[PDB]
Structure formats: C-alpha cells, structure tokens
C-alpha cells in the first residue's frame, strides 16, 4: 500500500537531517584553536623492563588496577599473570583452546576473562578456590570469535565477537543479558566509559558506534575512517574517544559534537593500526603500527611526538596504567616491553 | 624483614612455573600444526583420525553427549525468567555453565520434582518430558531431528603418529568473511586446502566455485602474514570430475578458454585406466593452481598438489611426506644452502 515508499522517504529526510545538523555545529576546527598553544615536549621513552616467557605470539593484555599485574595470552594456549615491578610472573594457567585473541583483568583484581577462536568467554576466579585458579564460567557462544571482552564489575561483563553482535552478559547466571546487533562487520574493539554506563564499539564497518548498557541501542555513530577499525579507546573524560584502523591513521571523535575532530598520520607510513591508548591526562596518543614500531602522537596538534621502537616483530597490543606511569607494549615475538 | 620471605616465595613460584614452561616450549616446538578449511563438515577430519587413534569409540558417544546439554540449557533458561524447591533449585543454578560436570545421576531426582510442579530454547518440551530415559542411550531419529546444538567453534584434534605429534584443526561455524581470523595462523606448519569440482547441476545453478577457489587461494598465498607457511593442495571430487567430463558434457571449457589449446604434460603419471580427455582436465586444474603457486615464490613457501585418492589410508601418507618436505626445505633455507 505504498507504505514502504513513504517510510523510505522519511528515512532519507532523517538521514539528511544529520548532515545539516553537523554542518551547523561545525563552526571551526581544532587546528584554529590549538595554534596558540606551544608545541609538545619531544618525548622518546625507554624500555625499562622486558618480560620474557611466552613460547609463541601474544595477542592482548590488560593493566591491573594496582599498576603492577599484567595478564598476557599467547598462541601456546596459556595465560600468564605478570608483576611489572619485580618482572616476576606470579603464575600461568593453560587453556582448553590453543587459539586466544583477547584478555581482561577485573577492576577489583578477582576475576580474569579469556576469549578467542573458541567462541567462549572463559572467566576464572583469580583469588578464590584457595589455590590454583579454576575455570569459573564459560559464557555461551554466538557464532563469532571473541575479539574483545571487558569487565565493568565482578557481576557482569561485556564481549564482542565477529558475528557483528556484542553481548553484555551476567556472570552469575551465565546467560546473555543484553544483545547488541547493530553492525555489518566483525566487532573488534570495546572500551568502557568512566561511569561504566555506556561504551563505543569499533568494528570492520569502518565505523565506531556508541552503545548503552541500559537500553541496548545506538545513540550516535561515527563513519570517518576508510578501512576496518582495529582499536578504540576513550579519552579519560567520557566525552570523546580515538579510533585506529587499517588506513594507517588514528582519528578523534567527540560525543557531544558527533563529528570527527583530528586525523593523525604521515606520508611515510602505510602500516595499519593495531592498538590505541591514551595517557592519564590524554594529551599523548599511543598508536601501535605493523612496521615493527609504534608512535606517540599529540592529541591536540597532530604532530608526531615521538617513536617507540624495540620489537623485531609487529606490535600486537599496548596499554597505559592507571596513574599514567608506564606504557606496556606487546608484539608477536613473545615479548612485552614496559616504557616510562 | 618480612618482605624477604614473601619475595623468595614469589621467586620460588616463578622457578616452578618456568620449569613447567620450558618443557611446554619443548613440546610446542615439536608439534606440526595443520589447518583444514574448505569442507562444510568437520567430520571429514574425524574419519581420517579414526583410522589410527580417543576417537576410536563409536559416534554414539558425541551424539548422546549433545543430548545431555539441551535439557540442562532448557531447564536453566525456563526457570531464569520467573513450595519446597529452594534447596533443590539452588544446586541446579550452581550447576549452570559447568563444563566438566555435565549431568550427574542425582540431578534427575532434583529435576523431576521441579518438572512435576504445576506452576513451572525452541525445542525444549520434547527433551524434557522423557527425563526418565537416562541410561549409561541409543537415540532415535525424531530426537536427533529436534536437537539443535550451537555451532561448534573450532574442531581441534591433537594426535601422535610415527612418533611425531600433529595438531590438526578444522574451522567451522564461522562467517564467510575470511579477513581477520586467518591472521591467527602463522605458526601453523601447513594449510591443507581441499578443492571440489562440479556437482550434479541437475536446473543448473552455475555458481562457478572453481574461480572463487582460485581467488581465495590468490588472496591467501599473497598474504603479508602468510608468506612463510606452505599450502598442501588437495583436489577432491576426482570421481565426480571423471564420469561428468566424457567428451562434451563438462562445462569446463566454457569457464576456462585456455583449456582448449591445453595439452597433457609429458612428466605426468595418469592412473592405469584414465582416458586422455579426463587426464588432460585433471591436470589442467593443478596447472592453473601452480600458475599462482610458481609465481611470487621467494624460496620461502611452496605448494604440494596431490589428487584425492580413493583409499583413505594414503592421504595421511601424502600429508606426512609433504610435512617432511616442508621441514627439509625450511632447514635448507635456514643455512643458505638451497
């Protein structure tokens, strides 16, 4: 009854509305504002400690809330827990599947999550059982390899897979609490907010989409990049974030503006982004490449603040600690490297 | 002070776990990993593994195991959306998502009382009324038709043959977007890539899966992170591509114009009883694949074309000899001797 035609016309008018809304809200840029600020201190960090031990390629990690413990997973099928101070690995735990792709350390230091090609989020009671860590939960699968799972508390987690669908779970009951099905590609990177009330997911749709743990819907959307988004991380304020994809550039997206801000790239680079992080303040943006090297950028002048090199293989992950003291990095040569 | 003993205990735990991890590295360095993709059934990897080896048990074990989880999932999902069933339901709630527990014999006694209560997945009423059929059993067709188990993530099988450990794995239940999960395979020793020919095609759909196989092989061979691993290429459906060729019944010439002026190589070894008109076509496909294999070869990864034989006992021998050749060529490239 010609209802689809009117629905499509209304949808097209709606889609055109956002263009004019963003054009009205884009009166200036950040370069015109950051001209007066003086340049960044040129920083080249040094490798303070190297953490040997893994037999094969590592893939992810997560700084503990105590700025001391690290959890690293390698292709050998074993997660080891570090002590960044003494460089003294506290213990290792094998896996059921040899292929793991993401880790997660609890904000309280009690549980540890593991995900990979097994399509199973395995949670482990790090401190319970009065002994060796045991398998606490094996969250149900959803036809997609886990690319990123993170803890917002000890009672529930949030995972993302390659089925273009994220899932906020409930560890106690071990079932899907909220399903997020608003993607056309592999959902890869997650990053919770300071208030843990919402997050933004970066997938292979060349787009970062903000979700909400309460209603389970998409409030905003960002379609700036050109290739598959690999990493994403919030500015430490909950009003903006940074995305890194295979187009060899990192971009800053604000929430209240709903628009791109700055792009970070050079001409003599082609390697895609593998991991993006900030500092404690948020002025330095840490981006790992595939040229066996990573770069620290300025999050306000788009200038290369410096380089961090020392891996003979492609870097896989990087993360800053709570007090912004150290920058851990990790490459496929079984090597983690702490910087400061 | 008292921190010294704590530091020394931490160091002792380190020494123990490192003594374990050295041997774990020794073990991992001696297992060759093989990747199987292409087929739409993981069981194709469980048959060849059943010809020698925990897989020697009957296939009824796995099917009966996929029947003890449906009832648990249904009873856990039905009661989660809601007289003396508190301590009886607490144990069931604590037995949720327990991998090594499965179903004890005392669970039916606690579940029958909850099922008898008048107040209390899609297919959940058939596998819940006959909760008294537990034994040791022998499922029927109507029960297997209603059972809907989730897609098994990765079929992983570590076996040991001829005093060497092999780790063969099939990747199923995943999406057809093969972009970001192939990267996870670099330490693999070989990718066994199986190809099929045309099917019955009778109402011809005309999908031309062969050219898509060429394109996927070109994308995998010329990958940046797969430049050191080798591909053992098998050509299945050798019997279906034999009686369907004849003299003009196969549409292989319409899909490849170069097949007309193509000739059978002199160094070929046709099976005793193979016609020239089918031998030429059987070698044309391997020549087309080697046209991509012989190019971009930096002496760093090669290909091993082999026809799928009828006897399932010699495909394993082909794989073993190919693994030996892979290790040999890697070692020769190590010392700059090749």
């Amino acid at each position, epitope marked *: 009854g010609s209802e689809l035609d009117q629905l499509r016309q209304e949808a097209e008018q709606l889609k055109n509305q956002i263009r004019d809304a963003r054009k009205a809200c884009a009166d200036a840029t950040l370069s015109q504002i950051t001209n007066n600020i003086d340049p960044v201190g040129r920083i080249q960090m040094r490798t303070r400690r190297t953490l040997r031990g893994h037999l094969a390629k590592i893939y992810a990690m997560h700084w503990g809330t105590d700025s001391r413990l690290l959890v690293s997973a390698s292709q050998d099928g074993k997660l080891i827990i570090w002590d960044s101070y003494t460089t003294n690995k506290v213990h290792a735990i094998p896996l059921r599947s040899s292929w793991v792709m993401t880790c997660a350390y609890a904000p309280s230091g009690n549980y540890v999550a593991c995900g990979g090609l097994d399509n199973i989020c395995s949670i482990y009671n790090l401190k319970t059982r009065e002994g060796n860590v045991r398998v606490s939960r094996e969250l149900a699968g959803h036809t997609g390899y886990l690319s990123c799972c993170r803890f917002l508390d000890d009672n529930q987690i949030v995972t993302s897979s390659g089925d*273009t669908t994220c899932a906020l779970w409930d560890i106690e009951t071990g079932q899907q609490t909220t399903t997020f099905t608003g993607h*056309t*590609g592999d959902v890869m990177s997650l990053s919770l907010a300071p208030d843990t009330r919402l997050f933004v997911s970066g997938a*292979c*749709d*060349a*787009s970062a989409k903000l979700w909400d743990v309460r209603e389970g819907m998409c409030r905003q959307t960002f*379609t700036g990049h*050109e*290739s*598959d988004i690999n990493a994403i991380c919030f500015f430490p304020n909950g009003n903006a974030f940074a995305t890194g994809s*295979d*187009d*060899a550039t990192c971009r800053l997206f604000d929430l209240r503006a709903d628009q791109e801000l700055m792009t970070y790239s050079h001409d003599n680079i*082609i390697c*895609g982004i593998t991991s993006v992080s900030f500092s404690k303040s948020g002025r330095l943006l840490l981006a790992g490449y595939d040229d066996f090297n990573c770069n620290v950028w300025d999050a306000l002048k788009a200038d290369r603040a410096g380089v961090l090199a020392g891996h003979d293989n492609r870097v896989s992950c990087l993360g800053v600690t709570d007090d912004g003291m150290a920058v851990a990095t990790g490459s496929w040569d079984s090597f983690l490297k702490i910087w400061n | 002070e008292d921190q010294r003993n704590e530091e020394k205990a931490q160091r002792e735990a380190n020494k123990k776990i490192e003594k374990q991890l050295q041997k774990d590295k020794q073990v991992y360095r001696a297992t060759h990993r093989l990747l199987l993709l292409g087929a739409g059934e993981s069981g194709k990897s469980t048959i060849v593994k059943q010809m020698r080896i925990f897989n020697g048990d009957s296939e009824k074990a796995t099917k009966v195991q996929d029947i003890k989880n449906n009832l648990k999932e249904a009873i856990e999902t039905i009661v989660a959306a809601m007289p003396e069933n508190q301590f009886r339901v607490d144990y069931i709630l604590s037995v949720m998502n327990v991998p090594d527990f499965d179903f004890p014999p005392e669970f039916y006694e606690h579940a029958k009382a909850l099922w008898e209560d008048e107040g209390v997945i899609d297919c959940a009423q058939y596998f819940l009324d006959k909760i008294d059929v537990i034994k040791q059993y022998v499922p029927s067709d109507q029960d297997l038709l209603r059972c809907r188990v989730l897609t098994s993530g990765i079929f992983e099988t570590k076996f040991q043959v001829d005093k060497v450990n092999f780790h063969m794995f099939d990747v199923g239940g995943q*999406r*057809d*977007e*093969r*972009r970001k999960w192939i990267q996870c395979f670099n330490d693999v020793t070989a990718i066994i890539f199986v190809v099929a020919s045309s099917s019955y095609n009778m109402e011809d*759909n*005309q*999908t*031309n*899966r062969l*050219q*898509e196989a060429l*394109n*996927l092989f*070109k*994308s*995998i061979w*010329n*990958n*940046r992170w797969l430049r050191t691993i080798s591909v053992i290429l098998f050509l299945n459906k050798q019997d279906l591509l034999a009686e369907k060729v004849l003299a003009g019944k196969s549409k292989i010439e*319409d*899909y*490849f*114009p*170069e097949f007309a002026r193509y000739t059978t190589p002199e160094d070929a070894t046709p099976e005793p009883g193979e016609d020239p008109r089918v031998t030429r076509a059987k070698y044309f496909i391997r020549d087309e694949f080697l046209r991509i294999s012989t190019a971009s070869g930096d002496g760093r990864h090669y290909c091993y074309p082999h026809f799928t034989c009828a006897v399932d006992t010699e495909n394993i021998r082909r794989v073993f000899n190919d693994c030996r050749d892979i290790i040999q060529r890697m070692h020769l490239r190590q010392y700059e001797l090749l």
Partner: nanobody
Amino acid sequence: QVQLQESGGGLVQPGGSLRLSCAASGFTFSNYKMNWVRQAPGKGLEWVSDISQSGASISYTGSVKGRFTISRDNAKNTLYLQMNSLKPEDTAVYYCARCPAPFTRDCFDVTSTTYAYRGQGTQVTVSS
C-alpha cells in the same frame, strides 16, 4: 561515509552491449585494488574482473575472459565496466566491490551479502 554508487543497467536484447559505472567516495580511490561481483537470481555470488592500484593486473573470469572491458580513472575516482557481446546467461545484479586492505594484493569481497565495501548493484537482463 564510504559510498559506492553503481549506474547503468537495464533491459537489452541478447547480443547487444552495455556500459556501466561505479563512483566511489569517502576514501582515496587511487590506492585501492578494486573489482566487480555479479549475482545471478537464485545463485551464489560470482567473480568477473579486477583492477590493480594502477592498471597492471587485469584479471578476468574465464567465463567472460577476453569479452568484457574494464577500466578506471583515478582522477575522477570512477571505475567502468563495459560488457560487449552480452549473453542470455549474464542476466544478474552487479555490485562494485573493493578490497579492504590498502596497498595489498589480497582480497575477500565475495561474501554471503555482509560485505560493507560494496554498494547496491544494477540489474541487467536479456530480451526474448
């Protein structure tokens, strides 16, 4: 966003010719290996052609080898495919897909209709 709009298509008697075009935006069109992808009604997706980042490798499908002519202009950010000697077996919907990896020779565009770097294609049939 990264949009890929296809033009052309329509009804034409068997044996005729027809040219169709793909206009892409939102990215640097010059440095991406591109290609097309057909889909026959009631059949899986199928491959036809390919363009390098400069025009070097022009791979065709043997079913259309030496018959269709593909080209592209990096200045105008456009890519054209011209079908000569159209057959009654080519009645299908054609999509303009692109490889995701910049500066690479690996591609994974044929999918189960979830690939994002591929716009809505144009319909082409034959007469009787």
